[PDB]
Design a binder for this molecule. Structure first.
Ligand SMILES: Cc1cc2nc3c(=O)[nH]c(=O)nc-3n(C[C@H](O)[C@H](O)[C@H](O)COP(=O)(O)O)c2cc1C
Ligand SMILES: Cc1cc2nc3c(=O)[nH]c(=O)nc-3n(C[C@H](O)[C@H](O)[C@H](O)COP(=O)(O)O)c2cc1C
Lengths: 191, 190
């Protein structure tokens, strides 16, 4: 169809969900290019565009990636005792590996803005995917050392997120909650 | 009231806006911009971001004055801060903060920065969609800004966002690298 699932911007922002169950239906090359181009058009620190995307479609490689995305029992990061998106990395027809080059973005106040820049691009990627009737999910749980070795990624590049990309197998699950605007927004100075 | 846009078109045409009129921002539009940010995905849905909304003129002027680039050892890519005046000019400044321990801290990476980036992009896309302009400002004296606004030191300030109606018609943005420069297909050989 290419255009049937098109949405108004605010509607796409509202209805976008993390998708973790994918059909094996292939992703049209046109849609993949559009999703990646959306990432390309993100703003970045001084327009340095420090993001780099490795796009994997090979089945054997995707299984190997999925096997590097388990949580180490009891040594998991905050909030993931397991990785609900682990199977998605094998099952989705495409996996986009989003990387950043740290010295190619702001490094001040002990903050490394390549992480911010990749976040911005990732959100363009995920909104564009959703706009085109695809699903995706940001995967932050992965063994970076082993994944870098598997993929042969240049040493200077830091891996930030993995993105399964494909057609959702099922309809929109009523996702997790959000905090009320009153909890996350404060008006004026604070005393 | 806004000229609605298809998602991909908003993504493509959103620009950093640094020149603003004094036209008031409808409270409904401000709410919608903040709601867009609220709806962003985050590490384990932790929603570590916090936003401070400043409208007071004197306070915005003071924020602007803390957003200079230092003479030497200034941040990479900014020999000056083209958005500095926008902070005083815009009707609204949104200060985006995050809590480092409320997001991923692993591999020496602090995902609060990623989470705030994701939310900021929702904010900027929604603003543009609604006929407003914004720009992500990363240059600021954090200690002084936190003191000015009463942000507890345990919250880190990540970005400042002037928000208002663009003074001028849409401008051409700077370049982007061609897609082949930022995308590689398949694993690497050797
Ligand atoms: C993390 C981050 C920090 C930024 N900091 C500043 C800043 O301090 N001053 C400024 O004028 N622009 C800033 N920008 C805006 C970029 O310069 C702008 O996004 C880039 O040149 C691309 O232009 P566009 O947004 O019009 O596409 C920042 C953007 C990002 C993503
Ligand atoms: C930086 C980041 C890392 C994430 N990592 C994972 C992950 O490793 N595994 C997973 O299943 N989901 C992951 N997610 C998805 C979040 O769990 C999800 O965005 C959140 O629960 C909100 O749900 P929604 O995206 O459907 O609105 C991640 C999201 C972000 C922003």
């Amino acid at each position: 169809n290419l255009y049937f699932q098109s949405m108004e911007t605010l509607e796409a922002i509202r209805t976008r969900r993390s998708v973790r169950k994918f059909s094996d239906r292939p992703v049209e090359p046109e849609k993949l290019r559009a999703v990646l181009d959306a990432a390309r058009l993100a703003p970045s620190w001084a327009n340095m565009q420090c993001w780099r995307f490795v796009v994997v479609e090979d089945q054997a490689t995707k299984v190997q990636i999925s096997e590097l995305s388990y949580v180490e029992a009891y040594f998991g990061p905050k909030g993931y005792k397991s990785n609900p998106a682990q199977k998605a990395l094998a099952e989705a027809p495409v996996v986009i590996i989003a990387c950043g080059e740290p010295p190619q973005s702001g490094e001040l106040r002990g903050q490394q803005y390549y992480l911010t820049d990749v976040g911005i691009a990732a959100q363009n990627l995920m909104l564009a995917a959703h706009d085109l009737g695809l699903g995706s999910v940001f995967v932050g749980v992965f063994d970076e050392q082993q994944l870098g070795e598997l993929l042969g990624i240049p040493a200077e590049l830091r891996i930030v997120g993995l993105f399964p990309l494909g057609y959702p197998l099922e309809g929109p699950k009523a996702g997790p909650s959000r905090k009320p605007l009153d909890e996350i927004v404060h008006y004026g100075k604070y005393q």
